Symmetry: D2
């Protein structure tokens, strides 16, 4: 599993469950092409987005639909979404864990990159 995302809710102190996200890869013509998508599980985790063979060098974008998450809890948040944009695998294949911590007016994202 070369790409995993974990999302946490800083207001309730819980995993952020059923959070949708879309992954894009920058194409040759400088456009964002859809690549994968899914929703976080009861543990706040989204696995199985891609495979080693499919996850080639490139620039990737993870767009996390934080607004729909907060609206479902009755909170009108600041951000439309949380976007993580990064170059992947340019020194060789790596495993990426993207962690996102959500508040209505704030978010933090961090990457753990292992071999």
């Amino acid at each position: 599993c070369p790409l995993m995302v974990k999302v946490l809710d800083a207001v309730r102190g819980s995993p952020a469950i059923n959070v949708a996200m879309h992954v894009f890869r920058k194409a040759a013509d400088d456009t964002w092409e859809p690549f994968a998508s899914g929703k976080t599980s009861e543990s706040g985790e989204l696995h199985g987005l891609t495979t080693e063979e499919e996850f080639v060098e490139g620039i990737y974008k993870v767009e996390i639909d934080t607004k729909s998450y907060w609206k479902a809890l009755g909170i009108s948040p600041f951000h439309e979404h949380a976007e993580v944009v990064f170059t992947a695998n340019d020194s060789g294949p790596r495993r990426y864990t993207i962690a996102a911590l959500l508040s209505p007016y704030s978010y933090s994202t961090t990457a753990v990159v292992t071999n």
Copy 2:
């Protein structure tokens, strides 16, 4: 000054100086139109991006070139940039301060909305 950005460096404990950023507004045709831009000052702050008459309701994107900042310090970063996307909505007088805290593999952004 209805829109201000402040950027901080978590590795050196300093304002992040000379950080470039561009502000975009979502057009009717779902495209991002350039709106404003600048570089942070010695205090890590960018002022004067827009005016009250110009800063109307809409969806805005602030793209902060964090990668160029870390490259200038010789540090290898994860993110291509830090992106803040939000709807601006005047429910009464509102000033927006976007704060971004930068580390090579992590960033946090928060909005302070005042009257």
Copy 3:
């Protein structure tokens, strides 16, 4: 003003106003001695904690009463308080700004050290 504290509320996107905090300095006998205290202003800031002559090298602790802040808003928090412990060291002129970003189950603190 060699030492300033700023506190922000990630749930409401506002300065955290009327937040009490105490500053302690580590004594020779490894005990915490009260040093300064106050409450944040309408801007979320606390100034005038100490002076240049008084703020000597040593180990300092800032204890921010985050629990009372969340209780005043009717929100159930995790932490008893947010604690920032640090050594102050003049290697040349140094001013310290401690920034704290508060959520009910999370807090972030950062130091900006300027000349």
Copy 4:
């Protein structure tokens, strides 16, 4: 496992390995009594600090020795340690995951509380 701690390094984008931490419980005489301690593993995790029977209602303090971690990497950091203080189990037994994200001049801590 009622209490787990995970620590991440925001400069290297990796788990923070071999990070020491001590857990204290506030005693009847308002003193902090040592309770448990350990070091994070290669995954940045510390498990097995306590048991359900031992982890009674109370106020707990987790002191993470972040300074020794950064010094071992040749970085002089701002904080002496990262302290997480909280009331545990006052509505019944819970499982607590404490997550800490470390930078030389900043840290964030978050709690995930599950039944």
